[PDB]
Amino acid sequence: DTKEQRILRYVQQNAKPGDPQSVLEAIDTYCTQKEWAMNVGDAKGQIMDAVIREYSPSLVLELGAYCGYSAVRMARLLQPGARLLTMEINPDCAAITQQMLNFAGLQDKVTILNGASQDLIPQLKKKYDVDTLDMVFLDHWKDRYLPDTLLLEKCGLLRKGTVLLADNVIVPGTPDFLAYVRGSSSFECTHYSSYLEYMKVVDGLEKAIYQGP
Ligand SMILES: O=C(NCc1cccc(CNc2ccc3[nH]ncc3c2)c1)c1cc(-c2ccc(F)cc2)cc(O)c1O
Ligand SMILES: [Cl-]
Numbered sequence: 001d002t003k004e005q006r007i008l009r010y011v012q013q014n015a016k017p018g019d020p021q022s023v024l025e026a027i028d029t030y031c032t033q034k035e036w037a038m039n040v041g042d043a044k045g046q047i048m049d050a051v052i053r054e055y056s057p058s059l060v061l062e063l064g065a066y067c068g069y070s071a072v073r074m075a076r077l078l079q080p081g082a083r084l085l086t087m088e089i090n091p092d093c094a095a096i097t098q099q100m101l102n103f104a105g106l107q108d109k110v111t112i113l114n115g116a117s118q119d120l121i122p123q124l125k126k127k128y129d130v131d132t133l134d135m136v137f138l139d140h141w142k143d144r145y146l147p148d149t150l151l152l153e154k155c156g157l158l159r160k161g162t163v164l165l166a167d168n169v170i171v172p173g174t175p176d177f178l179a180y181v182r183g184s185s186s187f188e189c190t191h192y193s194s195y196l197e198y199m200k201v202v203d204g205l206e207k208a209i210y211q212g213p
């Protein structure tokens with residue numbers, strides 16, 4: 001019996017089906033009071049919400065769903081018809097995420113793909129009928145942020161104005177990605193200082209807006 005299963009059960013027993021906000025609150029309570037977990041959390045979550053509301057993206061890709069906290073956070077603010085694709089390599093966590101979204105009533109807005117970003121990204125166009133992405137949320141292995149950004153570009157998935165939003169650019173940190181986007185003319189970057197989920201430790205989000213070649 002895992003921490004992730006305990007989080008899901010806590011949601012199911014302490015939130016209201018179909019009420020995404022109650023789901024977020026339940027997860028944040030459990031992770032504050034019972035067991036820490038690597039959800040983006042409320043501090044960084046509020047910044048995410050402000051970004052999502054600014055851009056109202058029609059198609060979002062998330063790398064690293066975990067238990068679905070960020071997927072619930074984003075999907076609850078998407079406009080009608082807008083969609084989120086989220087990728088998760090750990091099959092147990094993919095299943096938790098699907099159940100989390102089902103409980104939240106967000107399952108028609110989100111597709112949870114069980115697999116590795118580097119395998120799935122090149123299939124997005126032909127298999128998932130993607131043209132280009134409006135926003136990408138990076139929250140998977142930190143050493144994959146840079147390679148998968150470059151892969152997204154190679155596959156023609158970025159357009160002028162695509163918003164990349166990256167978790168954990170301070171802790172654990174993603175130093176190659178951060179140096180790269182901040183030094184590249186193809187990205188316009190902004191740093192949003194915040195706190196590591198459920199902890200009094202500084203962390204932050206980076207927004208990197210793609211500008212084309
Ligand atoms: O490391 C982190 N997250 C990534 C991660 C980690 C483990 C497993 C997976 C498996 N999921 C996965 C992987 C690769 C993938 N490829 N395609 C899809 C896909 C999906 C992903 C993380 C760590 C901390 C943290 C830990 C400890 C601490 F002290 C402070 C902070 C805080 C966070 O907010 C974090 O996000
Ligand atoms: Cl999350």
Ligand SMILES: [Cl-]
Binds near residue numbers: 042
């Ligand atoms: Cl928090």
Ligand SMILES: [Mg+2]
Binds near residue numbers: 038039139168
């Ligand atoms: Mg994270």
